[PDB]
Amino acid sequence: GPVPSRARVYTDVNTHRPSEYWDYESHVVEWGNQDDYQLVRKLGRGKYSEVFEAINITNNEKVVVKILKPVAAAKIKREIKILENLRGGPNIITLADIVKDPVSRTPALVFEHVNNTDFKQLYQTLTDYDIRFYMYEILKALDYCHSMGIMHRDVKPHNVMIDHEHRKLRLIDWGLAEFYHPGQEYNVRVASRYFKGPELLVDYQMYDYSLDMWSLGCMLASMIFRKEPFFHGHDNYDQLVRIAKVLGTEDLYDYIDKYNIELDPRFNDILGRHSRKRWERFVHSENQHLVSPEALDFLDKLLRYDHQSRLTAREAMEHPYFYTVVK
Ligand SMILES: Nc1ncnc2c1ncn2[C@@H]1O[C@H](COP(=O)(O)OP(=O)(O)O)[C@@H](O)[C@H]1O
Ligand SMILES: N#CCc1c[nH]c2cc(Cl)c(Br)cc12
Fold first, then answer.
1. SS3 of residue 272 by DSSP
2. One GO molecular function term?
3. Which of 81, 124, 162, 309 meets the CB 3.0–4.6 Å disulfide criterion with 24?
4. Which of 278, 270, 291, 203 is nearest to 247 (CA)?
5. Which residues contact ligand 1 via a Cβ below 6 A?
């Protein structure tokens, strides 16, 4: 069958921590007062929650309330435990309270509000320097959650909240996050389609923190090349074909061979044969202002099929692409 895999960093974090740290099912939830929050307006409804702008009437501060839908409040203790474990960490969203919603009768997570700069505005106007600056801020959040034994599993631009005036960034939406335990087989139905790593697309379940580094590389590629999304698959199968048209099919088959993966036979008629493209093939007059040899080298080190070969978050922080960022 498939060959096992382990992370090359933070392998022992959850064994050295007490069981209370990762055994989320044993966690007793400390319920707050739902009356402390007045809902103001609905911000959105995803597959798992309804999100509201609200006011914490005990300090008149803006908060965000995520009311879990019936279907998947089941995995609430996992999200609560992760948010409580990461609280106060660099650029991690702060969970302010946990209350029982009087209407849904489900848990409602209360978060610190971020006066987020409009998404399109960020994509369209962040400069080369700002991309480097904010990528460095995301890396601080990812190295912190990985060092704490957690993988985010849904890194994508809509999960990264930037208040551009205050040069503030927060990593949000921890509903898919999981504790990393070496040798554990995880569900591959995580991350958004365009940010899914090859390990998910080839159905390799023994993945780790490095999935987040692939997702981060997709974000960076879309930003610097002005191509949203960078890998534009029509579905999960075509997503792998879009990746292979850039990274090549030979390194894909070497990856499959190394881990002894059984590739879905559906791929035999659609993968074709492709040679890796040099990153300069994506440069043009409209993205030249965002591209540099250092950005391309950095990107090349994130976007690798072999999950064990990608830069870790802490190694990425050392890269020359960040030498210009004020520290
Ligand atoms: N702390 C926050 N401050 C401001 N807006 C937030 C906050 N948390 C979530 N949102 C907004 O609420 C919606 C739901 O967020 P969530 O479901 O947690 O993540 P996402 O929808 O980005 O995957 C999004 O539209 C997001 O912009
Ligand atoms: N894509 C896009 C826009 C955007 C949203 N959230 C981000 C976080 C970072 Cl780190 C960067 Br760089 C860009 C974005």
1. coil
2. protein serine kinase activity
3. 81
4. 278
5. 43-44, 46, 49, 51, 64, 66, 93, 111, 113-114, 116, 158-159, 161, 172-173
Question: How far apart (Å, rounded) are the C-alpha atoms in residues 121 and 163?
Answer: 12
> Are the beta carbons of 9 and 151 closer than 8 angstroms?
no
Q: Find out whether 243 and 198 touch, Cβ atoms under 8 Å.
A: yes
Q: What is the resolution of this structure in A?
A: 1.3
Catalytic residue among 101, 143, 154, 208: 154
Q: What's the rounded Cα separation, in Å, for the pair 292 and 325?
A: 14
Domain boundaries in the chain? 5-22+114-327, 23-113
321-327: list long-range contacts, CB under 8 Å, 24+ apart.
321/132, 321/135, 321/292, 321/294, 321/295, 321/297, 322/132, 322/135, 322/136, 323/294, 324/129, 324/132, 325/129, 325/132, 325/133, 325/136, 326/133
- Residue 154 known to be catalytic: yes
Q: 40 to each of 46, 52, 64, 95, how far by Cα in Å?
A: 18, 7, 10, 19
Q: How many CB atoms lie within 10 A of CB 282?
A: 18
* Euclidean distance between CA atoms 316 and 186, whole angstroms: 25
- Which of 4, 26, 1, 3 shows the shortest CA–CA distance to 179? 26
For residue 183, say whether it is annotated as part of any ligand binding site: no
Nearest ligand atom owner, CA of 52: 1
For residue 47, say whether it is annotated as part of any ligand binding site: yes
Q: Which residues contact 7 (CB under 8 A, 6 or more apart)?
A: 180, 182, 208, 209, 210
Residue 57 CA, ligand 2 centroid: distance in Å: 32
CB 53 within 8 A of CB 37: no
